[PDB]
Design a protein around this ligand. Structure first.
Ligand SMILES: OC[C@H]1O[C@@H]2O[C@H]3[C@H](O)[C@@H](O)[C@@H](O[C@H]4[C@H](O)[C@@H](O)[C@@H](O[C@H]5[C@H](O)[C@@H](O)[C@@H](O[C@H]6[C@H](O)[C@@H](O)[C@@H](O[C@H]7[C@H](O)[C@@H](O)[C@@H](O[C@H]8[C@H](O)[C@@H](O)[C@@H](O[C@H]1[C@H](O)[C@H]2O)O[C@@H]8CO)O[C@@H]7CO)O[C@@H]6CO)O[C@@H]5CO)O[C@@H]4CO)O[C@@H]3CO
Length: 474
Protein backbone atom coordinates (compact mmCIF):
# COMPACT_ATOMS: atom_id res chain seq x y z
CA UNK A 1 0.00 0.00 0.00
CA UNK A 2 1.87 3.05 1.30
CA UNK A 3 5.21 1.27 0.97
CA UNK A 4 5.04 0.88 -2.80
CA UNK A 5 6.74 3.92 -4.31
CA UNK A 6 7.35 5.91 -1.14
CA UNK A 7 10.34 8.21 -0.65
CA UNK A 8 12.41 6.76 2.20
CA UNK A 9 15.06 8.61 4.18
CA UNK A 10 17.56 6.65 6.29
CA UNK A 11 18.71 8.16 9.57
CA UNK A 12 21.61 7.04 11.76
CA UNK A 13 20.14 8.21 15.16
CA UNK A 14 23.41 9.21 16.85
CA UNK A 15 24.26 11.50 13.92
CA UNK A 16 21.13 13.42 12.90
CA UNK A 17 20.40 16.12 15.49
CA UNK A 18 21.10 16.44 19.21
CA UNK A 19 18.18 17.79 21.25
CA UNK A 20 15.95 17.11 24.26
CA UNK A 21 16.49 15.23 27.56
CA UNK A 22 18.17 11.79 27.67
CA UNK A 23 16.42 8.77 29.09
CA UNK A 24 17.35 6.93 32.27
CA UNK A 25 20.17 5.83 32.93
CA UNK A 26 21.32 9.28 31.83
CA UNK A 27 24.85 9.62 30.44
CA UNK A 28 27.32 11.48 32.64
CA UNK A 29 30.30 12.45 30.54
CA UNK A 30 31.14 14.60 27.49
CA UNK A 31 29.90 13.72 24.01
CA UNK A 32 32.27 13.66 21.03
CA UNK A 33 32.00 17.13 19.48
CA UNK A 34 29.52 17.20 16.60
CA UNK A 35 31.79 18.45 13.83
CA UNK A 36 34.67 16.19 14.83
CA UNK A 37 35.73 13.13 12.75
CA UNK A 38 33.48 10.12 13.42
CA UNK A 39 35.21 7.33 15.34
CA UNK A 40 34.57 3.65 15.99
CA UNK A 41 33.40 4.15 19.59
CA UNK A 42 32.52 7.84 19.77
CA UNK A 43 29.04 9.13 20.56
CA UNK A 44 27.91 12.55 19.28
CA UNK A 45 24.65 12.37 21.18
CA UNK A 46 22.02 12.67 18.47
CA UNK A 47 18.55 11.90 19.86
CA UNK A 48 15.12 10.91 18.58
CA UNK A 49 13.82 14.19 20.06
CA UNK A 50 16.07 15.91 17.53
CA UNK A 51 14.79 13.77 14.67
CA UNK A 52 11.26 14.90 15.57
CA UNK A 53 12.49 18.50 15.65
CA UNK A 54 13.93 18.19 12.14
CA UNK A 55 10.71 16.85 10.63
CA UNK A 56 9.91 20.16 8.91
CA UNK A 57 13.24 19.76 7.11
CA UNK A 58 12.25 16.24 5.99
CA UNK A 59 8.75 17.39 4.98
CA UNK A 60 10.27 20.14 2.85
CA UNK A 61 12.44 17.55 1.09
CA UNK A 62 9.36 15.43 0.43
CA UNK A 63 10.12 12.49 2.73
CA UNK A 64 7.23 10.04 3.11
CA UNK A 65 8.95 7.51 5.37
CA UNK A 66 11.85 7.34 7.78
CA UNK A 67 14.04 4.28 8.09
CA UNK A 68 15.97 4.40 11.38
CA UNK A 69 19.07 2.37 12.19
CA UNK A 70 18.76 0.51 15.57
CA UNK A 71 17.24 2.56 18.38
CA UNK A 72 17.08 0.11 21.30
CA UNK A 73 19.47 0.20 24.24
CA UNK A 74 22.97 -0.68 23.04
CA UNK A 75 26.60 -0.06 23.94
CA UNK A 76 27.62 0.73 20.33
CA UNK A 77 27.24 4.14 18.70
CA UNK A 78 25.65 2.40 15.70
CA UNK A 79 23.52 0.30 18.09
CA UNK A 80 23.76 -3.08 16.37
CA UNK A 81 24.98 -4.55 19.69
CA UNK A 82 21.60 -4.77 21.39
CA UNK A 83 21.36 -4.78 25.17
CA UNK A 84 17.56 -4.54 25.53
CA UNK A 85 15.00 -4.91 22.77
CA UNK A 86 12.26 -3.40 24.95
CA UNK A 87 13.89 -0.03 25.70
CA UNK A 88 14.79 2.76 23.31
CA UNK A 89 18.39 3.72 24.11
CA UNK A 90 18.71 6.25 27.00
CA UNK A 91 20.95 8.57 24.98
CA UNK A 92 18.29 8.75 22.25
CA UNK A 93 15.84 9.85 24.93
CA UNK A 94 14.10 6.63 25.88
CA UNK A 95 10.71 5.31 24.80
CA UNK A 96 9.02 8.69 25.25
CA UNK A 97 11.31 10.09 22.55
CA UNK A 98 10.29 7.40 20.05
CA UNK A 99 6.65 7.93 21.06
CA UNK A 100 6.90 11.67 20.41
CA UNK A 101 8.70 11.11 17.12
CA UNK A 102 5.94 8.75 15.94
CA UNK A 103 3.22 11.21 16.94
CA UNK A 104 4.73 14.12 15.00
CA UNK A 105 5.65 11.88 12.07
CA UNK A 106 2.19 10.36 11.76
CA UNK A 107 0.42 13.68 12.33
CA UNK A 108 2.18 14.86 9.16
CA UNK A 109 1.64 11.66 7.20
CA UNK A 110 5.13 10.22 7.61
CA UNK A 111 5.76 6.52 8.29
CA UNK A 112 8.64 5.25 10.46
CA UNK A 113 10.31 1.84 10.30
CA UNK A 114 12.86 0.36 12.70
CA UNK A 115 15.90 -1.83 12.26
CA UNK A 116 15.65 -5.31 13.71
CA UNK A 117 18.86 -7.07 14.72
CA UNK A 118 17.66 -10.53 15.68
CA UNK A 119 20.57 -12.78 14.74
CA UNK A 120 22.69 -11.69 17.67
CA UNK A 121 22.89 -9.41 20.68
CA UNK A 122 25.64 -7.38 22.27
CA UNK A 123 27.65 -8.84 25.15
CA UNK A 124 25.67 -6.55 27.47
CA UNK A 125 22.37 -8.36 26.90
CA UNK A 126 20.89 -9.89 30.08
CA UNK A 127 21.09 -13.53 28.97
CA UNK A 128 24.70 -13.18 27.84
CA UNK A 129 25.77 -11.47 31.04
CA UNK A 130 24.03 -14.30 32.88
CA UNK A 131 26.18 -16.80 30.96
CA UNK A 132 29.37 -14.91 31.80
CA UNK A 133 28.73 -14.68 35.53
CA UNK A 134 27.39 -18.20 36.07
CA UNK A 135 28.85 -20.34 33.28
CA UNK A 136 27.28 -23.82 33.10
CA UNK A 137 25.01 -23.04 36.04
CA UNK A 138 23.26 -20.26 34.14
CA UNK A 139 19.62 -21.03 33.22
CA UNK A 140 20.09 -18.87 30.08
CA UNK A 141 22.82 -21.06 28.57
CA UNK A 142 20.57 -22.15 25.68
CA UNK A 143 20.04 -18.57 24.47
CA UNK A 144 23.39 -18.77 22.71
CA UNK A 145 25.57 -21.29 20.87
CA UNK A 146 28.11 -22.02 23.61
CA UNK A 147 31.16 -24.00 22.53
CA UNK A 148 32.70 -24.29 25.98
CA UNK A 149 33.71 -22.52 29.20
CA UNK A 150 35.08 -20.05 29.96
CA UNK A 151 33.57 -17.99 27.13
CA UNK A 152 36.72 -15.98 26.31
CA UNK A 153 34.39 -13.15 25.30
CA UNK A 154 37.16 -10.54 25.07
CA UNK A 155 39.63 -12.52 22.96
CA UNK A 156 39.74 -12.99 19.19
CA UNK A 157 38.66 -16.58 19.81
CA UNK A 158 35.26 -16.52 21.57
CA UNK A 159 33.99 -19.86 22.89
CA UNK A 160 30.58 -19.36 21.24
CA UNK A 161 29.10 -18.78 17.77
CA UNK A 162 29.40 -15.09 16.82
CA UNK A 163 28.60 -12.90 13.77
CA UNK A 164 31.64 -13.13 11.48
CA UNK A 165 33.51 -14.51 14.50
CA UNK A 166 33.47 -11.10 16.19
CA UNK A 167 33.21 -11.68 19.97
CA UNK A 168 31.18 -8.46 20.39
CA UNK A 169 28.21 -10.08 18.65
CA UNK A 170 27.06 -13.37 20.33
CA UNK A 171 24.80 -15.33 17.96
CA UNK A 172 21.29 -16.03 19.26
CA UNK A 173 19.88 -19.56 19.35
CA UNK A 174 16.50 -18.92 17.73
CA UNK A 175 15.27 -22.54 17.90
CA UNK A 176 15.16 -22.29 21.70
CA UNK A 177 11.50 -21.55 22.55
CA UNK A 178 12.37 -18.82 25.09
CA UNK A 179 14.44 -17.05 22.42
CA UNK A 180 11.88 -17.28 19.63
CA UNK A 181 9.16 -16.12 22.02
CA UNK A 182 11.25 -13.12 23.06
CA UNK A 183 12.08 -12.10 19.48
CA UNK A 184 8.52 -12.56 18.25
CA UNK A 185 7.17 -10.55 21.17
CA UNK A 186 9.70 -7.83 20.25
CA UNK A 187 8.64 -7.72 16.62
CA UNK A 188 5.00 -7.48 17.70
CA UNK A 189 5.37 -5.02 20.58
CA UNK A 190 6.95 -2.20 18.60
CA UNK A 191 4.41 -2.51 15.82
CA UNK A 192 1.67 -2.01 18.43
CA UNK A 193 3.67 0.83 20.00
CA UNK A 194 3.11 2.66 16.71
CA UNK A 195 6.02 1.64 14.47
CA UNK A 196 5.15 1.13 10.79
CA UNK A 197 7.49 -1.70 9.84
CA UNK A 198 10.83 -3.48 10.10
CA UNK A 199 14.14 -3.52 8.26
CA UNK A 200 15.70 -6.89 9.02
CA UNK A 201 19.44 -7.08 9.63
CA UNK A 202 21.29 -9.96 7.90
CA UNK A 203 18.18 -12.20 7.90
CA UNK A 204 20.22 -14.92 6.18
CA UNK A 205 22.04 -15.64 9.46
CA UNK A 206 18.77 -17.19 10.64
CA UNK A 207 18.18 -19.86 7.93
CA UNK A 208 15.20 -21.33 9.76
CA UNK A 209 12.30 -20.66 7.32
CA UNK A 210 9.55 -21.03 9.94
CA UNK A 211 10.88 -18.12 12.03
CA UNK A 212 10.45 -15.50 9.29
CA UNK A 213 7.03 -16.85 8.34
CA UNK A 214 5.97 -16.59 12.00
CA UNK A 215 7.62 -13.16 12.21
CA UNK A 216 5.60 -11.96 9.22
CA UNK A 217 2.31 -13.26 10.59
CA UNK A 218 2.93 -11.70 14.02
CA UNK A 219 3.90 -8.31 12.52
CA UNK A 220 1.23 -8.21 9.81
CA UNK A 221 -1.16 -9.47 12.46
CA UNK A 222 -0.51 -6.44 14.67
CA UNK A 223 -0.73 -4.05 11.71
CA UNK A 224 -1.65 -5.30 8.20
CA UNK A 225 -0.08 -2.18 6.70
CA UNK A 226 3.29 -2.83 8.33
CA UNK A 227 6.22 -2.86 5.91
CA UNK A 228 8.79 -5.66 6.17
CA UNK A 229 12.05 -5.32 4.26
CA UNK A 230 15.17 -7.46 4.61
CA UNK A 231 18.88 -6.82 4.12
CA UNK A 232 20.07 -9.05 1.25
CA UNK A 233 22.94 -7.78 -0.92
CA UNK A 234 22.33 -10.03 -3.94
CA UNK A 235 19.42 -12.03 -5.41
CA UNK A 236 16.69 -12.74 -2.84
CA UNK A 237 14.02 -14.95 -4.42
CA UNK A 238 13.81 -17.21 -1.35
CA UNK A 239 12.78 -14.29 0.89
CA UNK A 240 10.27 -12.81 -1.56
CA UNK A 241 7.80 -15.59 -2.32
CA UNK A 242 5.18 -13.71 -0.35
CA UNK A 243 5.33 -15.60 2.95
CA UNK A 244 8.31 -13.69 4.37
CA UNK A 245 9.45 -10.18 3.39
CA UNK A 246 7.65 -7.57 1.29
CA UNK A 247 10.94 -6.45 -0.22
CA UNK A 248 14.68 -6.21 0.29
CA UNK A 249 17.35 -3.52 0.17
CA UNK A 250 18.09 -3.33 -3.56
CA UNK A 251 21.89 -3.24 -3.42
CA UNK A 252 22.02 -4.86 -6.90
CA UNK A 253 20.19 -1.82 -8.29
CA UNK A 254 22.67 0.38 -6.45
CA UNK A 255 25.59 -1.37 -8.16
CA UNK A 256 23.94 -0.93 -11.58
CA UNK A 257 23.12 2.76 -11.25
CA UNK A 258 26.57 3.50 -9.82
CA UNK A 259 28.31 1.64 -12.63
CA UNK A 260 26.26 3.30 -15.38
CA UNK A 261 26.20 6.87 -14.02
CA UNK A 262 29.54 6.58 -12.26
CA UNK A 263 31.18 5.57 -15.51
CA UNK A 264 34.96 5.37 -15.41
CA UNK A 265 35.00 8.22 -12.89
CA UNK A 266 33.67 5.82 -10.26
CA UNK A 267 36.11 5.16 -7.43
CA UNK A 268 36.02 1.36 -7.63
CA UNK A 269 38.78 1.14 -5.00
CA UNK A 270 36.61 2.88 -2.42
CA UNK A 271 33.52 0.81 -3.26
CA UNK A 272 35.54 -2.41 -3.23
CA UNK A 273 36.29 -1.70 0.44
CA UNK A 274 32.68 -2.47 1.35
CA UNK A 275 29.81 -4.77 0.50
CA UNK A 276 29.24 -2.90 -2.76
CA UNK A 277 32.20 -4.81 -4.13
CA UNK A 278 34.18 -3.74 -7.16
CA UNK A 279 31.45 -2.21 -9.32
CA UNK A 280 31.93 -2.86 -13.04
CA UNK A 281 31.38 0.08 -15.45
CA UNK A 282 28.22 -0.29 -17.54
CA UNK A 283 27.01 0.99 -20.89
CA UNK A 284 23.37 1.88 -21.60
CA UNK A 285 22.18 -1.52 -22.86
CA UNK A 286 23.95 -3.56 -20.18
CA UNK A 287 22.56 -1.21 -17.53
CA UNK A 288 19.05 -1.62 -18.93
CA UNK A 289 19.42 -5.41 -18.99
CA UNK A 290 20.18 -5.34 -15.26
CA UNK A 291 17.06 -3.26 -14.58
CA UNK A 292 14.93 -5.57 -16.70
CA UNK A 293 16.16 -8.53 -14.67
CA UNK A 294 15.75 -6.77 -11.33
CA UNK A 295 12.31 -5.52 -12.33
CA UNK A 296 11.09 -8.89 -13.55
CA UNK A 297 12.47 -11.66 -11.33
CA UNK A 298 10.08 -10.85 -8.47
CA UNK A 299 6.31 -10.36 -8.32
CA UNK A 300 5.29 -6.83 -9.43
CA UNK A 301 4.12 -5.85 -5.93
CA UNK A 302 7.59 -6.72 -4.61
CA UNK A 303 9.40 -4.76 -7.34
CA UNK A 304 7.36 -1.68 -6.42
CA UNK A 305 8.26 -1.96 -2.73
CA UNK A 306 11.99 -2.54 -3.22
CA UNK A 307 14.17 -0.26 -1.11
CA UNK A 308 16.10 1.47 -3.89
CA UNK A 309 19.17 3.03 -2.33
CA UNK A 310 22.55 3.98 -3.75
CA UNK A 311 24.43 4.13 -0.47
CA UNK A 312 23.92 3.44 3.23
CA UNK A 313 25.74 3.23 6.56
CA UNK A 314 27.47 0.19 5.04
CA UNK A 315 28.85 1.95 1.92
CA UNK A 316 31.09 4.90 1.05
CA UNK A 317 29.12 8.12 0.54
CA UNK A 318 27.88 8.93 -2.98
CA UNK A 319 29.94 12.08 -3.55
CA UNK A 320 33.14 10.21 -2.59
CA UNK A 321 32.14 7.33 -4.86
CA UNK A 322 31.99 9.84 -7.74
CA UNK A 323 35.36 11.47 -6.91
CA UNK A 324 33.66 14.77 -6.12
CA UNK A 325 31.49 14.79 -9.26
CA UNK A 326 28.38 16.69 -8.14
CA UNK A 327 26.71 16.33 -11.56
CA UNK A 328 27.07 12.54 -11.47
CA UNK A 329 25.81 12.21 -7.91
CA UNK A 330 22.86 14.36 -8.92
CA UNK A 331 22.02 12.18 -11.90
CA UNK A 332 22.25 8.91 -9.95
CA UNK A 333 19.95 10.27 -7.24
CA UNK A 334 17.59 11.78 -9.79
CA UNK A 335 17.26 8.51 -11.73
CA UNK A 336 16.11 6.62 -8.61
CA UNK A 337 12.89 8.65 -8.54
CA UNK A 338 12.06 7.55 -12.11
CA UNK A 339 12.15 3.80 -11.46
CA UNK A 340 9.63 1.45 -9.81
CA UNK A 341 10.41 0.83 -6.14
CA UNK A 342 10.97 3.03 -3.07
CA UNK A 343 13.64 5.66 -3.71
CA UNK A 344 15.76 5.69 -0.55
CA UNK A 345 18.26 8.35 0.46
CA UNK A 346 20.93 8.05 3.16
CA UNK A 347 20.91 11.14 5.41
CA UNK A 348 23.33 13.76 4.14
CA UNK A 349 23.54 12.55 0.54
CA UNK A 350 20.97 15.17 -0.50
CA UNK A 351 23.29 17.97 0.67
CA UNK A 352 26.55 16.44 -0.51
CA UNK A 353 28.29 15.12 2.60
CA UNK A 354 31.44 13.15 1.75
CA UNK A 355 33.25 10.20 3.28
CA UNK A 356 34.91 6.85 2.66
CA UNK A 357 33.90 3.64 4.42
CA UNK A 358 32.58 3.37 7.97
CA UNK A 359 32.99 5.37 10.22
CA UNK A 360 33.82 8.06 7.64
CA UNK A 361 30.29 7.76 6.21
CA UNK A 362 28.63 8.37 9.59
CA UNK A 363 29.50 12.00 10.18
CA UNK A 364 27.31 14.47 12.02
CA UNK A 365 24.54 15.86 9.83
CA UNK A 366 25.39 19.34 8.56
CA UNK A 367 22.62 21.84 9.29
CA UNK A 368 24.44 24.94 8.04
CA UNK A 369 22.55 25.70 4.82
CA UNK A 370 25.40 27.82 3.43
CA UNK A 371 27.40 24.58 3.48
CA UNK A 372 24.95 22.39 1.55
CA UNK A 373 25.41 21.50 -2.08
CA UNK A 374 22.13 23.20 -2.98
CA UNK A 375 22.11 21.64 -6.45
CA UNK A 376 21.96 18.08 -5.10
CA UNK A 377 19.23 18.98 -2.61
CA UNK A 378 17.06 20.79 -5.15
CA UNK A 379 17.22 17.83 -7.51
CA UNK A 380 16.05 15.47 -4.76
CA UNK A 381 13.31 17.89 -3.72
CA UNK A 382 12.38 18.44 -7.37
CA UNK A 383 12.25 14.77 -8.38
CA UNK A 384 10.54 13.66 -5.19
CA UNK A 385 7.72 16.11 -5.90
CA UNK A 386 7.65 14.95 -9.52
CA UNK A 387 7.19 11.33 -8.42
CA UNK A 388 4.53 12.41 -5.93
CA UNK A 389 2.48 14.28 -8.54
CA UNK A 390 2.88 11.58 -11.21
CA UNK A 391 1.86 8.26 -9.55
CA UNK A 392 2.53 6.33 -12.75
CA UNK A 393 6.21 6.66 -11.88
CA UNK A 394 5.75 4.22 -9.01
CA UNK A 395 3.18 1.88 -10.56
CA UNK A 396 3.97 1.55 -14.30
CA UNK A 397 6.25 -1.04 -16.00
CA UNK A 398 9.75 -0.41 -17.33
CA UNK A 399 10.30 -0.53 -21.11
CA UNK A 400 13.63 0.31 -22.74
CA UNK A 401 13.37 2.68 -25.72
CA UNK A 402 16.91 3.71 -26.58
CA UNK A 403 20.31 2.50 -25.45
CA UNK A 404 23.75 3.50 -26.71
CA UNK A 405 26.91 4.66 -24.96
CA UNK A 406 25.80 6.59 -21.89
CA UNK A 407 22.47 7.51 -23.45
CA UNK A 408 19.33 5.81 -22.20
CA UNK A 409 15.60 6.27 -22.74
CA UNK A 410 12.91 4.17 -21.11
CA UNK A 411 9.16 4.50 -20.74
CA UNK A 412 7.06 4.32 -17.57
CA UNK A 413 3.47 4.21 -18.77
CA UNK A 414 2.68 7.66 -20.26
CA UNK A 415 6.19 8.88 -19.54
CA UNK A 416 9.41 8.70 -21.49
CA UNK A 417 12.52 9.15 -19.36
CA UNK A 418 15.71 10.13 -21.17
CA UNK A 419 19.02 9.85 -19.34
CA UNK A 420 22.23 11.48 -20.57
CA UNK A 421 24.95 9.92 -18.41
CA UNK A 422 27.93 11.21 -20.40
CA UNK A 423 30.20 14.29 -20.61
CA UNK A 424 28.79 15.23 -24.02
CA UNK A 425 25.37 16.65 -25.05
CA UNK A 426 22.70 14.28 -26.32
CA UNK A 427 20.22 15.30 -28.99
CA UNK A 428 16.82 13.79 -28.22
CA UNK A 429 15.80 12.65 -31.71
CA UNK A 430 15.87 8.86 -31.39
CA UNK A 431 12.90 6.72 -32.55
CA UNK A 432 10.04 6.58 -30.03
CA UNK A 433 9.22 2.96 -30.92
CA UNK A 434 5.54 3.71 -30.36
CA UNK A 435 5.81 5.45 -26.97
CA UNK A 436 3.57 8.37 -27.96
CA UNK A 437 0.78 6.84 -30.14
CA UNK A 438 -1.36 10.01 -30.19
CA UNK A 439 1.64 11.52 -31.96
CA UNK A 440 1.01 15.08 -30.83
CA UNK A 441 2.50 17.87 -28.71
CA UNK A 442 4.82 16.65 -25.91
CA UNK A 443 6.44 18.38 -22.92
CA UNK A 444 9.52 17.70 -20.78
CA UNK A 445 8.04 17.89 -17.28
CA UNK A 446 11.50 18.77 -15.95
CA UNK A 447 12.60 21.65 -18.19
CA UNK A 448 9.25 22.76 -19.59
CA UNK A 449 10.59 22.24 -23.10
CA UNK A 450 7.82 21.53 -25.62
CA UNK A 451 7.79 19.97 -29.08
CA UNK A 452 5.80 17.86 -31.56
CA UNK A 453 7.23 14.51 -32.71
CA UNK A 454 7.13 13.39 -36.34
CA UNK A 455 8.45 10.37 -38.23
CA UNK A 456 8.22 8.43 -34.98
CA UNK A 457 11.17 10.37 -33.54
CA UNK A 458 11.45 12.49 -30.40
CA UNK A 459 11.83 16.22 -31.09
CA UNK A 460 13.47 17.79 -28.05
CA UNK A 461 16.63 19.94 -27.92
CA UNK A 462 20.00 18.62 -26.78
CA UNK A 463 20.05 17.01 -23.35
CA UNK A 464 22.97 18.63 -21.46
CA UNK A 465 25.74 16.47 -19.90
CA UNK A 466 24.56 14.38 -16.96
CA UNK A 467 21.02 15.64 -17.32
CA UNK A 468 17.56 14.10 -17.15
CA UNK A 469 14.28 14.64 -19.00
CA UNK A 470 10.76 13.33 -18.48
CA UNK A 471 8.39 13.68 -21.41
CA UNK A 472 4.62 13.17 -21.47
CA UNK A 473 2.16 13.96 -24.25
CA UNK A 474 0.91 17.42 -23.30
O1 LIG B 1 36.81 -11.94 9.89
C1 LIG B 1 35.76 -11.08 9.47
C2 LIG B 1 36.16 -10.28 8.24
O2 LIG B 1 37.10 -9.27 8.68
C3 LIG B 1 37.56 -8.40 7.64
O3 LIG B 1 36.50 -7.68 7.05
C4 LIG B 1 36.13 -6.42 7.65
C5 LIG B 1 35.95 -5.39 6.52
O4 LIG B 1 37.22 -5.09 5.96
C6 LIG B 1 35.28 -4.11 7.02
O5 LIG B 1 35.01 -3.25 5.92
C7 LIG B 1 33.98 -4.46 7.74
O6 LIG B 1 33.08 -5.04 6.84
C8 LIG B 1 31.84 -4.34 6.62
C9 LIG B 1 31.44 -4.49 5.15
O7 LIG B 1 32.38 -3.80 4.33
C10 LIG B 1 30.03 -3.94 4.91
O8 LIG B 1 29.64 -4.14 3.56
C11 LIG B 1 29.05 -4.64 5.86
O9 LIG B 1 29.00 -6.01 5.57
C12 LIG B 1 27.86 -6.48 4.84
C13 LIG B 1 28.33 -7.37 3.68
O10 LIG B 1 29.15 -6.63 2.80
C14 LIG B 1 27.11 -7.93 2.94
O11 LIG B 1 27.55 -8.81 1.91
C15 LIG B 1 26.21 -8.70 3.93
O12 LIG B 1 26.89 -9.84 4.38
C16 LIG B 1 26.23 -11.10 4.17
C17 LIG B 1 26.74 -11.70 2.84
O13 LIG B 1 26.18 -10.98 1.75
C18 LIG B 1 26.39 -13.18 2.72
O14 LIG B 1 27.00 -13.72 1.55
C19 LIG B 1 26.90 -13.92 3.96
O15 LIG B 1 28.29 -13.75 4.06
C20 LIG B 1 29.09 -14.93 4.30
C21 LIG B 1 30.17 -15.02 3.21
O16 LIG B 1 29.55 -15.28 1.96
C22 LIG B 1 31.20 -16.11 3.52
O17 LIG B 1 32.26 -16.04 2.56
C23 LIG B 1 31.78 -15.91 4.92
O18 LIG B 1 32.55 -14.75 4.94
C24 LIG B 1 33.77 -14.83 5.71
C25 LIG B 1 34.93 -14.31 4.86
O19 LIG B 1 35.13 -15.15 3.73
C26 LIG B 1 36.21 -14.26 5.70
O20 LIG B 1 37.27 -13.71 4.93
C27 LIG B 1 35.98 -13.41 6.96
O21 LIG B 1 35.79 -12.06 6.61
C28 LIG B 1 36.77 -11.15 7.13
C29 LIG B 1 37.30 -10.25 6.00
O22 LIG B 1 37.94 -11.04 5.01
C30 LIG B 1 38.27 -9.22 6.56
O23 LIG B 1 38.74 -8.37 5.53
O24 LIG B 1 34.88 -13.94 7.71
C31 LIG B 1 33.63 -14.00 6.99
C32 LIG B 1 32.60 -14.57 7.95
O25 LIG B 1 32.85 -15.94 8.22
O26 LIG B 1 30.72 -15.88 5.88
C33 LIG B 1 29.76 -14.81 5.69
C34 LIG B 1 28.79 -14.87 6.86
O27 LIG B 1 27.62 -15.60 6.53
O28 LIG B 1 26.22 -13.40 5.09
C35 LIG B 1 26.53 -12.01 5.38
C36 LIG B 1 25.73 -11.63 6.61
O29 LIG B 1 26.47 -11.86 7.80
O30 LIG B 1 25.84 -7.84 5.01
C37 LIG B 1 26.95 -7.30 5.76
C38 LIG B 1 26.37 -6.50 6.92
O31 LIG B 1 25.50 -5.48 6.46
O32 LIG B 1 29.45 -4.41 7.21
C39 LIG B 1 30.76 -4.93 7.55
C40 LIG B 1 31.01 -4.60 9.01
O33 LIG B 1 31.04 -3.19 9.21
O34 LIG B 1 34.27 -5.33 8.83
C41 LIG B 1 34.82 -6.61 8.45
C42 LIG B 1 35.03 -7.39 9.73
O35 LIG B 1 35.81 -6.64 10.66
Amino acid sequence: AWYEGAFFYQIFPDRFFRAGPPGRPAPAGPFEPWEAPPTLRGFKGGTLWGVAEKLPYLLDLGVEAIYLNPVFASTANHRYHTVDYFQVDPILGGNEALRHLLEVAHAHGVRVILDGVFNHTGRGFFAFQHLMENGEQSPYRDWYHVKGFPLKAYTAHPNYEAWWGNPELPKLKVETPAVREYLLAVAEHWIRFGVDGWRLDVPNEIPDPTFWREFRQRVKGANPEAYIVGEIWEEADFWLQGDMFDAVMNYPLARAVLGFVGGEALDRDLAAQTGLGRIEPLQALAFSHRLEDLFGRYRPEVVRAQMNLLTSHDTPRLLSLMRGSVERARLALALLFLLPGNPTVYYGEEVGMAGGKDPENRGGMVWEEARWQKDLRETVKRLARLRKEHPALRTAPYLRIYAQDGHLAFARGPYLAVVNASPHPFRQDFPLHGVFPRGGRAVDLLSGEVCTPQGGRLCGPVLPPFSLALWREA
